[PDB]
Write a protein that binds this ligand. Structure first.
Ligand SMILES: *[C@@H]1O[C@H](CO)[C@@H](O[C@@H]2O[C@H](CO)[C@@H](O[C@@H]3O[C@H](CO[C@H]4O[C@H](CO[C@H]5O[C@H](CO)[C@@H](O)[C@H](O)[C@@H]5O)[C@@H](O)[C@H](O[C@H]5O[C@H](CO)[C@@H](O)[C@H](O)[C@@H]5O)[C@@H]4O)[C@@H](O)[C@H](O[C@H]4O[C@H](CO)[C@@H](O)[C@H](O)[C@@H]4O)[C@@H]3O)[C@H](O)[C@H]2NC(C)=O)[C@H](O)[C@H]1NC(C)=O
Lengths: 45, 146, 73, 50, 92, 50
């Protein structure tokens, strides 16, 4: 049980990392998609 | 312009300030926004009295983007979107690596189709090429972090 | 001031419009420098024109100081 | 020339002149203003030989 | 949706590889369709619809795996969602 | 990548597949001469061996 709790510590750390990275990556995706096309779509309109 | 006759021997004048488009068949890919004709005379240090003449006609064409938007941009955006989902997919599933690697494979198979459509003109990177590079680096970073 | 100009055909001496005083001569090569020599541009300007790396430019304030190379000042 | 040989025609490079001195044009002539540079290849050298 | 959301399940594998197959078809289809931009072919509209739906199914598979793989050591179960999924939905 | 993930061979074999795709792409762009291996071809061969 002690070893399982020690492993669950790492698993929880990994889950928190996952939950941070999900938002970070979605924000990076949308910002990167905007940063290319926004200027040319503004010039077009 | 006249190839051999110079402006002191044969003089060419534009019939009208703009090309005649009254018979123009509409293109399925390009819209001619503007057209104009200009007569240029140039004098050379050999010969003050023999100007050389040309008429330059130019057409400002804007591409219709719909084909590339539909067949290129949309699947790249879809692959980009799926890249983030690997971080919500739990590790215990074992599907994280398969998901990210299959997204990378699909992106590479799509690059195999995109490289032939993108112009090979190496003066500057196309905007779609920069977007492809962004998507590739994004997937690579996602795999490393995963 | 009066400067030679290539705006008219043939080159002629024309008094500068008000606000421009400097005569200039610009010469550069093109595809026909094999026989015709450098292109020549003559005019008057309010300031000495800019020069591309392949364009020779000369600027002077005197009258008729920008002749065609085949014409004397 | 295939119709004429070195006995019939003598080929030579064009001579130009500057400052009353002639010189042979030993290079491909390129317009510095109107030559649209190619999209993939930069011309580094362009000699000519007889 | 019939592949178990359990260890050994291959839900995401299937969905992503079917999307890859659809991308191979997109390569194949793009050789036949002309390059004009006046309109979008019916086959092209169907292809894009299929790809969008496939990405939605990938997202749903990821969500379902994220739900099933949870553990009491990591997630506190919401009683409202518990009642809705286990009681209200069967009663609906 | 940990062995308990059960995905270690998948990554390597998929990268081999991607390198195969790149070799398919590049080999269509060059003449099949025997004078030398192109630099990108040497890199591809070395990468596939590794
Ligand atoms: C897309 O790309 C194309 C090129 O591929 C580009 O085309 C250029 O378009 C611009 C304008 O948009 C052009 O600029 C104009 O050029 C005119 C050329 O005129 C020549 O002749 C003039 C004298 O002739 C006059 O009189 C006769 C009969 O009386 C008549 O037929 C002529 O039309 C004209 O009225 C001469 O003055 C002029 O001068 C050039 O050369 C002299 C010396 O060599 C030099 O001093 C000048 O600087 C100039 O290089 C030339 O020989 C020109 O008339 C016209 O002038 C207008 O503007 C100037 C200042 O802007 C005013 O002073 C004047 O009153 C006029 O309003 C103007 O300069 C350019 O030549 C085109 N170039 C080519 C290669 O085609 C398109 O623009 C691009 N389009 C995009 C990106 O959308």
């Amino acid at each position: 049980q002690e070893s399982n709790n020690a492993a669950a510590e790492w698993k929880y750390v990994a889950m928190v990392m996952d939950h941070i990275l999900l938002g970070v990556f979605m924000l990076v995706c949308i910002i990167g998609t905007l940063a290319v096309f926004a200027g040319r779509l503004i010039e077009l309109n | 312009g006249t190839w051999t006759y110079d402006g002191s021997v044969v003089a060419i004048n534009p019939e009208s300030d703009q090309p005649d488009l009254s018979n123009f068949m509409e293109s399925g890919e390009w819209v001619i926004k503007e057209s104009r004709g200009w007569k240029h005379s140039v004098t050379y240090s050999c010969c003050p009295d023999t100007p050389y003449l040309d008429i330059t006609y130019h057409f400002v064409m804007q591409r219709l983007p719909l084909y590339f938007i539909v067949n290129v941009i949309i699947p790249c955006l879809l692959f980009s979107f799926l890249t983030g989902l690997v971080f919500y997919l739990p590790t215990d599933s074992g599907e994280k690596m398969t998901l990210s690697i299959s997204v990378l494979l699909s992106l590479t198979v799509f690059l195999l189709v995109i490289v032939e459509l993108i112009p090979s003109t190496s003066s500057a990177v196309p905007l779609i090429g920069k977007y492809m590079l962004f998507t590739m680096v994004f997937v690579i970073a996602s795999i490393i972090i995963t | 001031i009066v400067c030679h100009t290539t705006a008219t055909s043939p080159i002629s001496a024309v008094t500068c419009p008000p606000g421009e005083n400097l005569c200039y001569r610009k010469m550069w090569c093109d595809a026909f420098c094999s026989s015709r020599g450098k292109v020549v541009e003559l005019g008057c300007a309010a300031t000495c024109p800019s020069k591309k790396p392949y364009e020779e430019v000369t600027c002077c304030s005197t009258d008729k100081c920008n002749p065609h190379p085949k014409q004397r000042p | 020339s295939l119709k004429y040989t070195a006995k019939e025609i003598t080929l030579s490079l064009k001579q130009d002149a500057k400052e009353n001195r002639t010189y042979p044009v030993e290079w491909i002539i390129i317009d510095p203003e109107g030559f649209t540079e190619n999209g993939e290849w930069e011309i580094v050298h362009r000699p000519a030989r007889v | 949706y019939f592949l178990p959301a359990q260890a050994g399940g291959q839900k995401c594998t299937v969905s992503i590889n079917v999307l890859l197959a659809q991308t191979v078809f997109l390569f194949l289809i793009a050789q036949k369709i002309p390059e004009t931009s006046l309109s979008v072919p019916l086959l092209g509209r169907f292809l894009i619809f299929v790809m969008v739906v496939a990405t939605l199914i990938v997202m749903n598979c990821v969500i379902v795996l994220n739900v099933s793989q949870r553990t009491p050591t990591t997630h506190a179960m919401s009683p409202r969602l518990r009642h809705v999924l286990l009681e209200l939905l069967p009663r609906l | 990548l940990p062995a308990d993930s059960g995905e270690k061979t998948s990554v390597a074999i998929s990268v081999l597949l991607a390198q195969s795709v790149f070799l398919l792409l590049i080999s269509k762009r060059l003449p099949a001469t025997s004078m030398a291996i192109p630099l990108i071809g040497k890199f591809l061969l070395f990468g596939m061996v590794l």
